[PDB]
Design a binder for this molecule. Structure first.
Ligand SMILES: O=P(O)(O)O[C@@H]1[C@@H](OP(=O)(O)O)[C@H](OP(=O)(O)OP(=O)(O)O)[C@@H](OP(=O)(O)O)[C@H](OP(=O)(O)OP(=O)(O)O)[C@@H]1OP(=O)(O)O
Ligand SMILES: O=P(O)(O)O[C@@H]1[C@@H](OP(=O)(O)O)[C@H](OP(=O)(O)OP(=O)(O)O)[C@@H](OP(=O)(O)O)[C@H](OP(=O)(O)OP(=O)(O)O)[C@@H]1OP(=O)(O)O
Ligand SMILES: O=P(O)(O)O[C@@H]1[C@@H](OP(=O)(O)O)[C@H](OP(=O)(O)OP(=O)(O)O)[C@@H](OP(=O)(O)O)[C@H](OP(=O)(O)OP(=O)(O)O)[C@@H]1OP(=O)(O)O
Ligand SMILES: O=P(O)(O)O[C@@H]1[C@@H](OP(=O)(O)O)[C@H](OP(=O)(O)OP(=O)(O)O)[C@@H](OP(=O)(O)O)[C@H](OP(=O)(O)OP(=O)(O)O)[C@@H]1OP(=O)(O)O
Ligand SMILES: O=P(O)(O)O[C@@H]1[C@@H](OP(=O)(O)O)[C@H](OP(=O)(O)OP(=O)(O)O)[C@@H](OP(=O)(O)O)[C@H](OP(=O)(O)OP(=O)(O)O)[C@@H]1OP(=O)(O)O
Ligand SMILES: O=P(O)(O)O[C@@H]1[C@@H](OP(=O)(O)O)[C@H](OP(=O)(O)OP(=O)(O)O)[C@@H](OP(=O)(O)O)[C@H](OP(=O)(O)OP(=O)(O)O)[C@@H]1OP(=O)(O)O
Lengths: 361, 364, 367, 369
């Protein structure tokens, strides 16, 4: 029972139908956008209907008694003609049959140099403004005087805010543990801290087994071991904004006394759910929407300037050790890992629905 | 030569006299309603005359689909309460002129109310007629039976006054906006800066919109269009949203590649500019002559906006049409908004002469 | 005849002598730093004296009401051993042989070369209105002595050291092609009548102090009047390390009140000279030295070399001619339009080409 | 039990009594000098006794015989008459009324007030390595008798005079500056990676003897190791009259034992106490008295008042926390004191707040032995 998403123009001349709201990027390639446009042939007589896929980075928010700063960079734009009619998919053939002979198909493909859906609304403490990477499917009708005069009337247009969602690639090699070790000499006795994860890539919702191995050869005591999942966000267009936020924390009060060692495996799950405060964090949608999660790890492709990603999202495990004196010292170290959605898979009946996403409040 | 407004009951037992139809809200405080009621003492014998100020939000042309009362206050004019002495010069004067059957009333506004806003929608618009009315009503009540008191319609008289938004002392900081675009496969920015002279403008006052296009692209800015958009948000019963152009100006200059053009267009947002007066937030009925565009809503600190009923705001929109763009960004998609407030000008700091007139407002 | 610059350590164990304060970058190559170190052999017994050339970008200034923010990136560092002698610096120069003979056999030579990936001396102290902080690219020649327990403690004692703030100065290259006129034209349609503005300079490269002949050619086919023609030399500064600061400042202006009436045209040649002298306010401008020093000028145009990330220049300085036209409104409206266009050009120093020695303190002359 | 300080003239004709040796400057105002002069009425018959407060900057050594050996700028001078008694003759303060009652009717009061444009007691005797000479700001209370000869020439004998070297001592105001904070980062040659050093003190003003908690936050993103973190209290002295002498001296040093390895960060709070006690060598340092005296400390931070030319302070004393990082693999590019940041702070004395009983004592200050 396939749920199809429809939206209709104001003047009811153009209606657009999509198979999905969210389109999978599995690194190797990206799911193309196959849909259909249903035209009212009376209202489109001597007109031309096109469909456009735009990816755009945006920056800046409305502010009272504060100067309005706005910025947009288009990162990809591609347009095709649906009407008049000039391979197909099963989804289209089926939707055409169901909807009539006024239904016309469109296929818009993503390239490999784009980021995935990333958004950020800042907290009061944060410097820097609202920014994000949107993806817009837009169907719209033009006259033959609308071409060559650059006119696209609003009532004849219909836009949809789809998501490019980051999934792990289908064939992956076996994953080496994400492991590092440090040696903090204190009076020329070493305090050795090793940190190790099971794998390099974790899935949203999947728990992360963090193995910590303190080897205290010092005369000092490790009073406290804290383990975090930090999300590091770097806005890399317009404004060099930097956010780092804990999205998961576990704090054992294990003591490692002088001339002893303690191995230990904490399990963290970095979730948007864990954060009442959803601001200052890179999400893959709006705070209000239900289907919105933490943004996946940015995957910069070989020889692609990172700045064309707009927002850079990375995750890391941070281990903090509190260490006694004879006040006290605190050392900390980071271990990077990638967080994305699980790898993808290998008549029909249609229930039609408004594209508008489900809120939580 | 003070023009006084009178209206008389059907049974001619109660007549009400007001100094004004329109009462000034200058944010700090609101002009109280000082008037007098003239009773025919024969026809109000063993009766009680009151005067009430009601503010109410309404929705629908259910006969009337929905009403929320936002403020109600009533006072007794007859029989006379206490001193019986006037509170204002206008009253003392009206009493002297009209006789000893004249009784004064003072009804005050609070600070949590909106100002007169009305909206009759166009055919294209979804959502219905709605508005915030203010009613001064004088009426007589008697008892012919021990078990109940009665209020005849014939003994009552209602007046639809306006709460009109006038400027405070304070003005916001000089409104300013910047926006930049970088179109697909273009290394080069198109910068649009917009500046108004001040934050508050008066109805009828012209608005000097300074536009500063800095085209570093290989594309040409074919057209600069400047609008005054009025944004209306019905915030009781139905979440209706209207946005309408009430002024538009289209500069003739084009901005060629690798050039910049500063320029100052002047707009005047007026109800006069709009043949179609429907779909727009007004401060009165379409038919009445003294009716203008609604003033900017001024929500007071820590007052839930929903108790305003209709939210009216104004903004300058600057749209740039750009050559070679195949549908990526359009005129209203290559655009910025700059907010400003629109209200009426600030107020000011032996007997006089009175010409009496029917309260009924002048149609067009 | 030849003015030599000396500076001496606090403990008087190490003295350094340089031919120049300012070393020429003529794009093709950069003048190497040839000097000598005079050691007091009693005070350097069982010690090692080195000389280091450091180029470093710096950012941030002292503030009593503001938290102290500082940042340094070393862009180049190279060190050589002068004592004990090992011939580290290889073959010698005439300047050294002469200085050795004049100063004694306790004099030892050093040669430190610049590479091609460095910027030239650029500095910037901001004005009150300006958002970002003090920043610049310094060049330091430093001679210093270390014990064999000084390598063993990673310590380099201050009294035994001597630093000199030299300048890398941007000169035009010796072989240059013939220089095309730097010219562009624009066509500002106003009601579909064009206003054509052509701007032309004599050449692409000008020298500090050289006058710039800006030819403006307005061809007004509109119904509007050009009320005023203003011509500027704007200096555009982009801090491209730590903080993305942007400054644009007029360093020369000429404003004819020539009127070009409807359906007429006016050619005209204004002459501007972009000088630090023209600017009372010396803050917000990219200089090649400190505001106080006399020999300080406007910074030369940054010359980014082929396939060198611009960010390793630290501060990017460029110059342009800006032409502003004020244009009358059709309704005699109280305001009017203004159009403007930029023509880029580069600004640097002119191209390059017994002995007797008067010794002098390196310290630069203030105003 | 109030300890009063007396000194007597050689000829025993004039004795001066002070409540204190040290007078408090708390920025807002300065403690005036209230004392009394006890005259031997036989020895001051037909004479006039005055008391003078002089503040003077000096440079060099004190004039021997006739030779001018020292440069002197008077920064303030004020004189009053104690004998014969002037007008009311009545005490101004309880201390005086009490001292008069205790000492007899040959006791006369004096009040000499400080203005706001003066520095506080600063002195400096240089070390062998130091260029520049002995200098300081002295405060002298002097009582002396003057008489008149047969030729018209009034005389001031030394034997009839008594001088006291009081101290103007810097105590804290109500106000404190904002919590001192510094950040510095380095990116070493051929290194894409920053070494971040942040430094934070608890407050802006510290008291002499109070410990200073210096919080250091090294964030080593480099492949190099921070081998040593050294934390100093440096005292910066600027002689701003006659000779532009500049001294900077460590008066406290602490060397944390933690090293910061590649790709780690270490927060840490060292505690320093800048004291004269910590310094065997007491030369090259700005003190508030002579090296020999016991009550002598480090000089307080100079507090230049708004629109008062700093040069009329004579010596400028300031304090700062310096944090030096020693870093592995650096071949001379940047050193310990070249990979360093400073955080300024002010150092002064703590804020201020029927008859009594008097134990009299020689003004002469207690030496160390
Ligand atoms: O001839 P068209 O119908 O193809 O073009 C019009 C259409 O363009 P757009 O969609 O913005 O691209 C209107 O938007 P719309 O369909 O949503 O709504 P409406 O048609 O206005 O109800 C727009 O209204 P807005 O931006 O002012 O609100 C209007 O502007 P303007 O002259 O001010 O107004 P009117 O001429 O309507 O009085 C345009 O006229 P030009 O650009 O002058 O040719
Ligand atoms: O409830 P409100 O007012 O706070 O938020 C609504 C508003 O969002 P906005 O202004 O972008 O913040 C609408 O934008 P709009 O008028 O610009 O529409 P256009 O795209 O221009 O046609 C949006 O589109 P529509 O349904 O009206 O077409 C609508 O649905 P939805 O697509 O899901 O939201 P988004 O993903 O677009 O934010 C949002 O509601 P919810 O469904 O609860 O989220
Ligand atoms: O043409 P119409 O019918 O639409 O307008 C009339 C209608 O008011 P309407 O506009 O609908 O509100 C009458 O209402 P009614 O009799 O139902 O009774 P109530 O109003 O309930 O007492 C009203 O009479 P009344 O009030 O004294 O009884 C009368 O005066 P008035 O209120 O002063 O004028 P407005 O400023 O209100 O227009 C209006 O006159 P005209 O504008 O000249 O035609
Ligand atoms: O080793 P460092 O570089 O970290 O610190 C040294 C440095 O301290 P400061 O920068 O003032 O904090 C010297 O000061 P400075 O700049 O004047 O002279 P330098 O030219 O540097 O000698 C100081 O000598 P000084 O002040 O008397 O001249 C010296 O002490 P001292 O016993 O004399 O030992 P050495 O003179 O034999 O080294 C310190 O050594 P330690 O305490 O062992 O570390
Ligand atoms: O007040 P400031 O900062 O503007 O200028 C002074 C400052 O310059 P700074 O910017 O730090 O280099 C001193 O640096 P310092 O004490 O840290 O010592 P080091 O430099 O580490 O040795 C410098 O000392 P020193 O170098 O001779 O020892 C001194 O002479 P000098 O370099 O010849 O003059 P400039 O040509 O540098 O201005 C400068 O004095 P003035 O004569 O008034 O100008
Ligand atoms: O070289 P000198 O003359 O300038 O300084 C001396 C002078 O100091 P003084 O002016 O009082 O401060 C002597 O007092 P004095 O009455 O002759 O002098 P005046 O009456 O003032 O003229 C003082 O002796 P004593 O008689 O008070 O016992 C003697 O030692 P000490 O008590 O430790 O000194 P203080 O504790 O009092 O400072 C001082 O010696 P050194 O400073 O070490 O050379």
């Amino acid at each position: 029972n396939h749920v199809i998403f429809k939206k209709i123009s104001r003047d009811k001349s153009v209606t657009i139908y999509l198979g999905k709201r969210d389109y999978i990027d599995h690194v190797e390639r990206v799911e193309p956008v196959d849909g259909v446009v249903l035209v009212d042939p009376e209202l489109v007589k001597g007109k031309r209907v096109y469909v456009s896929l735009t990816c755009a980075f945006r920056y800046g928010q409305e502010d009272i008694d504060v100067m309005g700063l706005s910025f947009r960079r288009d990162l990809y734009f591609s347009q095709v003609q649906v009407f008049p009619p000039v391979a197909t998919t099963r989804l289209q053939e089926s939707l055409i049959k169901k909807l009539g002979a006024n239904t016309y198909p469109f296929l818009l493909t993503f390239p490999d140099y784009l980021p995935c859906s990333v958004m950020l609304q800042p907290a009061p403490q944060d410097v820097g403004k609202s920014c994000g990477v949107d993806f817009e499917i837009k169907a719209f009708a033009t006259h033959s005087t609308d071409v060559e005069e650059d006119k696209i009337p609003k009532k004849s247009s219909v836009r949809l805010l789809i998501r490019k969602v980051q999934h792990a690639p289908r064939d992956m090699g076996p994953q080496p543990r994400a492991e590092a070790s440090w040696q903090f000499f204190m009076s020329d006795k070493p305090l050795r801290l090793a940190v190790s994860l099971s794998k390099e890539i974790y899935y949203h919702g999947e728990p992360i087994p963090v193995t910590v191995a303190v080897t205290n050869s010092t005369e000092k005591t490790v009073k406290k071991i804290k383990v975090l999942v930090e999300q590091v966000t770097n806005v890399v267009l317009y404004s060099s904004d930097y956010y780092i936020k804990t999205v998961a924390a576990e704090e054992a009060q294990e003591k490692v006394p002088p001339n002893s060692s303690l191995t230990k495996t904490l399990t963290l799950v970095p979730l948007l759910a864990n954060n009442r405060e959803r601001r200052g964090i890179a999400l893959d949608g709006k705070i209000k929407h239900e289907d919105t999660n933490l943004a996946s790890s940015t995957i910069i492709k070989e020889g692609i300037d990172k700045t064309v990603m707009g927002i850079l999202v990375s995750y890391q495990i941070k281990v903090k050790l509190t260490v006694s004196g004879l006040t006290s010292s605190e050392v900390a170290t980071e271990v990077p890992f990638r967080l994305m959605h699980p790898q993808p898979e290998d008549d029909e009946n249609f229930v039609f629905e408004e594209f508008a996403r489900q809120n939580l409040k």
